[PDB]
Amino acid sequence: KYQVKQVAEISGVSIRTLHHYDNIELLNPSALTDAGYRLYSDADLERLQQILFFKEIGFRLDEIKEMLDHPNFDRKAALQSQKEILMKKKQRMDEMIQTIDRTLLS
Amino acid sequence: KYQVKQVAEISGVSIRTLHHYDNIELLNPSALTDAGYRLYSDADLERLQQILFFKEIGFRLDEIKEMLDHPNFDRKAALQSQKEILMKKKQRMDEMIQTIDRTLLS
């Protein structure tokens, strides 16, 4: 029911980006207009939403492609897994910063 | 005075890695043996050291290539700049984590 331009509007996601999704089979248009323009369902938006969220959380376009279709996917698990990844990525920054403060004492 | 294999030993940096450095003009051997083997000075190690440090701090091989040769380079500035970059990279993680905790309440 929604043309590419409508969703890019609704979501705030770029057309260019949205195209890229279609291209990597990450998010594909459900229908097609009679002139050949791509059409999107609400279930389609329902997916764009998952995408934007995993993306917000820290996932790369590719690992998101996986998660989405996989059967009995474990959300709680993934999120709890990510939270740990982030916690390590953070502590690592903290170390780098410390190292800089130590050096910056001369 | 030091052959590739010696430094890879002294530094703990891989030969493969060290080679890559020579290849991107990041760190180049001073001399050459009579058979054509690459030789490194101490000033050369003196550089490998700067490299390993900027690398530890968070710099990519390329931005390090710059810093090294540039004339009146401002260390204090760079480090203070990096510390900020890191501080933002950190706060960003923190947000992502928060977002996950919020979601993980259902």
Side-chain angles (χ1 to χ4, degrees), chain A residues 1-65 67-69 71 73-88 90-106, chain B residues 1-65 67-69 71 73-88 90-106:
Chain A
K1 198 213 294 65
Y2 317 92
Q3 206 146 303
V4 181
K5 193 187 171 190
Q6 275 114 68
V7 353
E9 196 65 12
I10 295 171
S11 74
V13 169
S14 153
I15 291 198
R16 190 160 309 308
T17 334
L18 291 164
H19 187 57
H20 177 49
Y21 289 176
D22 186 4
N23 282 177
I24 51 180
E25 237 70 31
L26 174 59
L27 178 74
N28 296 133
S30 287
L32 225 62
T33 189
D34 312 71
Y37 310 141
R38 291 164 301 182
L39 295 193
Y40 287 96
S41 79
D42 299 58
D44 264 352
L45 295 205
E46 253 267 64
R47 195 184 175 69
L48 173 55
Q49 190 195 55
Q50 299 160 65
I51 297 175
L52 264 9
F53 168 101
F54 283 124
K55 193 72 186 308
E56 177 87 321
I57 284 312
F59 296 104
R60 300 172 308 195
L61 273 319
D62 31 88
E63 44 189 300
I64 287 187
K65 196 181 307 189
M67 315 173 99
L68 293 180
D69 55 60
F73 171 56
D74 206 348
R75 278 252 299 180
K76 175 127 198 175
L79 295 190
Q80 231 128 214
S81 184
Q82 245 312 70
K83 171 176 165 201
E84 264 186 89
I85 295 275
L86 260 7
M87 260 158 97
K88 180 195 287 57
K90 188 181 162 167
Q91 233 299 116
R92 182 179 72 79
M93 310 276 72
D94 210 30
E95 229 68 68
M96 284 181 255
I97 286 160
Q98 299 178 182
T99 295
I100 287 173
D101 278 327
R102 190 210 306 139
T103 48
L104 254 49
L105 288 181
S106 285
Chain B
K1 198 213 294 65
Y2 317 92
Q3 206 146 303
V4 181
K5 193 187 171 190
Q6 275 114 68
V7 353
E9 196 65 12
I10 295 171
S11 74
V13 169
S14 153
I15 291 198
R16 190 160 309 308
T17 334
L18 291 164
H19 187 57
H20 177 49
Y21 289 176
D22 186 4
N23 282 177
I24 51 180
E25 237 70 31
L26 174 59
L27 178 74
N28 296 133
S30 287
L32 225 62
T33 189
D34 312 71
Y37 310 141
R38 291 164 301 182
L39 295 193
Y40 287 96
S41 79
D42 299 58
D44 264 352
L45 295 205
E46 253 267 64
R47 195 184 175 69
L48 173 55
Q49 190 195 55
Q50 299 160 65
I51 297 175
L52 264 9
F53 168 101
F54 283 124
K55 193 72 186 308
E56 177 87 321
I57 284 312
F59 296 104
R60 300 172 308 195
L61 273 319
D62 31 88
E63 44 189 300
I64 287 187
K65 196 181 307 189
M67 315 173 99
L68 293 180
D69 55 60
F73 171 56
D74 206 348
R75 278 252 299 180
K76 175 127 198 175
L79 295 190
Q80 231 128 214
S81 184
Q82 245 312 70
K83 171 176 165 201
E84 264 186 89
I85 295 275
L86 260 7
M87 260 158 97
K88 180 195 287 57
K90 188 181 162 167
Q91 233 299 116
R92 182 179 72 79
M93 310 276 72
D94 210 30
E95 229 68 68
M96 284 181 255
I97 286 160
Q98 299 178 182
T99 295
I100 287 173
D101 278 327
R102 190 210 306 139
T103 48
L104 254 49
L105 288 181
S106 285

